Ligand binder design. Structure first.
Ligand SMILES: *C[C@@H](C)C(=O)n1cc(C)c2c(-c3ccc4c(c3)CCN(C)C4)cncc21
Ligand SMILES: [Mg+2]
Ligand SMILES: [Zn+2]
Length: 199
């Protein structure tokens, strides 16, 4: 376990541009590879499958704006432990060539992706340029991939995580923040349906 001496803020912050996340409304059929529970504010997804996350604003942010994703453990007693891939998957060398093998969160389909091992906090994050919607689209979507199961021993080790999405300007200053819980499992639709029944 790499231990950090800080914890990233999780405070929701729409900021000047009205930043917030959206998710597809995918339902809980057996065939779904990712599904989002609004009641739990929790994303359920399969290992290394595309998770679309929409980025919404009310006004266009300045040029060079970027969007960063970072995972932390949800439980207070684990929050200072850096979220990382388990030993097996890190050594599996399943990298797309861009992502460090230790990083839990990847972005797919974006050649401008940038990965950070923070030299002071030791936290991992992934950042991409933030684009307005393309011609013929009404949304900006990032395709995230979670590269370990929540049950991966020596990684998340059955502990729940939060993903924190931050909108930043070109200089790294905070423009907006949103977050959601994540469970990575082989049966996201069933797992979402079950957890919502336990409400
Ligand atoms: C970097 C991302 C957050 C960004 O600059 N961004 C995302 C979105 C969705 C967006 C818009 C935008 C907002 C709302 C609508 C539309 C575009 C298109 C039409 N529908 C109805 C609403 C604008 N600028 C930037 C931006
Ligand atoms: Mg929300
Ligand atoms: Zn793993």
């Amino acid at each position: 376990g790499s231990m950090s001496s800080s914890v990233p803020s999780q405070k929701t912050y729409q900021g000047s541009y009205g930043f917030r996340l959206g998710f597809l409304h995918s339902g809980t059929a057996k065939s779904v590879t990712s599904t989002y529970s609004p009641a739990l504010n929790k994303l359920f997804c399969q290992l290394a499958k595309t998770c679309p996350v929409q980025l919404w604003v009310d006004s266009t942010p300045p040029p060079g704006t970027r969007v960063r994703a970072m995972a932390i453990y949800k439980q207070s007693q684990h929050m200072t432990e850096v979220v990382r891939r388990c030993p097996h998957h890190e050594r599996s060398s399943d990298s797309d060539g861009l992502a460090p093998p230790q990083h839990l969160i990847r972005v797919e389909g974006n050649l401008r992706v940038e990965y950070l091992d923070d030299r002071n906090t030791f936290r991992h994050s992934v950042v991409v340029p933030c684009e307005p919607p393309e011609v013929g689209s009404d949304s900006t979507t990032i395709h995230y991939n979670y590269m370990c199961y929540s049950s991966c021993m020596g990684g998340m080790n059955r502990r729940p995580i939060l993903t924190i999405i931050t909108l930043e300007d070109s200089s790294g200053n905070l423009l907006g923040r949103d977050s959601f819980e994540v469970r990575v499992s082989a049966s996201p639709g069933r797992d979402r349906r079950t957890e919502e029944e336990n409400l």
